[PDB]
Amino acid sequence: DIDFGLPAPAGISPGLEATRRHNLGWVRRLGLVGDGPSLAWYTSWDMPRLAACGFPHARGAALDLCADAMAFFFVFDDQFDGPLGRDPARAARVCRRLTGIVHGAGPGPGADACSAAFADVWARSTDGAHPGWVARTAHEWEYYFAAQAHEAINRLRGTPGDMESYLQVRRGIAGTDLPLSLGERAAGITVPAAAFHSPQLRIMREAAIDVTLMCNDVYSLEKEEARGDMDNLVLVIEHARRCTRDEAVTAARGEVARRVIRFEQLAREVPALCAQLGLSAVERAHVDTYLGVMEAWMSGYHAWQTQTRRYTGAPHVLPSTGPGYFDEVLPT
Ligand SMILES: CN(C)[C@H]1CCc2ccccc2C1
Ligand SMILES: [Mg+2]
Ligand SMILES: [Mg+2]
Ligand SMILES: [Mg+2]
């Protein structure tokens, strides 16, 4: 009964079905997903539809990379729904292993499934990419991995943070701007740095990422609250404001809506901004596609989460009385 006012997706990638086939083989081949309950549970998430709705510009092997990257995010995420997420030092050490892969230390044969899957996603991501994209996205991955242990610290504390501290942890553990870096890469575009760092596009990028993680906070609250998770916008608002759950959900909707309004107000300025910078027609085309990538990510993430089984299913198939996975795939 919660709708954030986002438009339905203007399009879906035509590669959904082909990518479903690729990604099913990929998660099994890497050892990221097993057979039986884990495979049925993974399948019920519909990672291919997340990729096709979230990245409608992606075609062919580009959409495959989007789905595999999402597969890594979601499988790796769930490994912390258990003792690992209550052990910050252990989480930090595991995440340092993954961070070493970001910065050039490939894992080698026989690495664990999470290390091997990440290394494959990261190698495919950087192949042929602009060095400015590689440097930025490498730092985005570092933030994602490094933030996990702080979520665990907050779990042990047992109170939500203030809004500023919530944003610092939650933006990291949500994957920071990685979905947009992935969408840019999958669309085959390179945002000119002069446009990328405009105040309008910097604010818009931040707003779009906040929109999707906050939409997720509302839909994933039931499975997260029961596990003692603290970095969820609804819990943060309730704790800060001393309000009811309904009032906190309504306020969370408002945090999303005001960011969508800001994004759309600034998007109106993007044609003029490109003219002021004297960008070439091709540069302007890449900026226009970047705008579409951001718009499609916001609408597509939400379209996916309304139809997936991940959020309605989790409390029943992986109750909070046990770990949030059927198989351990991340050695700690
Ligand atoms: C690590 N989490 C599984 C993240 C992965 C990326 C993402 C992007 C937007 C909204 C929610 C999420 C869940
Ligand atoms: Mg999670
Ligand atoms: Mg998480
Ligand atoms: Mg969530």
Which token pair is 123?
């190698």
| Residue found under tokens 């991501």 | 125
Residue 212 beta carbon below 6 angstroms from any ligand 1 atom: yes
- Give dist(CA 173, CA 77) in Å, integer: 9
Query: Quick one: CA dihedral 218, 219, 224, 225, positive or negative?
Result: positive
How far, CA to CA in Å, does 313 sit from each of 42, 257, 276?
11, 27, 50
The CA distance from 273 to 250, in Å, is 35
Closest C-alpha residue for ligand 1 atom 13: 174
Residues with CB under 5 A from ligand 3 (ion): 77, 173
Give the three-class secondary structure for 327.
Answer: coil
Q: Is 1 annotated as a binding residue?
A: no
Identify the DSSP state of 87: -
The answer to whether 236 and 160 have CB atoms below 8 angstroms apart is yes
Distance CA 304, CA 293 (A): 16
Q: In this structure, what are the phi and psi dihedrals at residue 60, rounded to the nearest 5 degrees?
A: 60, -130
Ligand 1 pocket check: which of 72, 73, 169, 211 to mutate, most ligand atoms within 8 Å of Cβ? 73
> Would the annotation count 23 as a binding residue?
no
Backbone angle region of 5, left / alpha / beta, with phi > 0 → left and psi within -120 to 50 → alpha? left
Protein residue whose Cα sits closest to atom 7 of ligand 1: 174
Q: How many Å apart are CA 330 and CA 332, to the nearest integer? A: 6
Spatial distance between the Cα atoms of 130 and 27, rounded to a whole number of angstroms: 28
Angle of CA points 159, 234, 163, to nearest 5°: 65
Q: Give the number of whichever ligand sits closest to the CA of residue 148.
A: 3
CA of 325 to the centre of ligand 3 (A): 13
Separation CA 236–CA 159 (nearest Å): 9
Q: How far, in Å, is the centroid of ligand 1 from the Cα of 176?
A: 9
Question: Which domains are present in the chain?
Answer: 16-317 (1.10.600.10)
328 labelled ligand-binding: no
Number of residues in the chain: 332
Q: Is the CB of 55 under 6 A from ligand 1?
A: no
Query: How many helices, marked H, and strands, marked E, lie in the chain?
Result: 17, 0
Distance (Å, rounded) from C-alpha 324 to C-alpha 77?
Answer: 10
DSSP string, 96-134: HHHHHHHTT----TT--HHHHHHHHHHHHHHTT--HHHH
Q: Does ligand 1 come within 6 angstroms of the Cβ of 172?
A: no
Q: Which of 53, 216, 305 to mutate to test the pocket of ligand 1 (most atoms within 8 A of CB)?
A: 216
Of 128, 15, 11, 138, which is closest to residue 67 (Cα–Cα)? 15
Identify the experimental approach: X-ray
* Resolution in angstrom units: 1.4
Question: Among all ligands shown, which has an atom nearest to the Cα of 227?
Answer: 2
Q: For residues 325 and 238, what is the distance between their CA atoms, to the nearest angstrom?
A: 29
Taking a C-beta distance cutoff of 8 angstroms, is the pair 216, 174 a contact? yes
On whether 224 is known to bind a ligand per the annotation, the reply is yes
140 is in an annotated binding site: no
DSSP-based three-state secondary structure for 47? helix
Residue that the structure tokens 């019920």 belong to:
44
Closest ligand (CA of 220): 4
Packing angle between helix 113-126 and helix 16-30, nearest 10 degrees? 130
Q: Tell me the chain's radius of gyration from C-alpha atoms.
A: 19
Beta carbons within 8 Å of 229's beta carbon, 6+ residues apart: 151, 155, 235
Measured in whole angstroms, the distance separating CA 104 from the mean position of its chain's CA atoms is 22
Per-residue CA distances from 55 to 75, 168, 286 (Å): 20, 26, 15
| Atom of ligand 1 minimally distant from the CA of 297 | 9
Q: Is the beta carbon of 180 within 6 A of some atom in ligand 1? A: no
177, 196, 201: which is closest to 266 by C-alpha?
A: 201
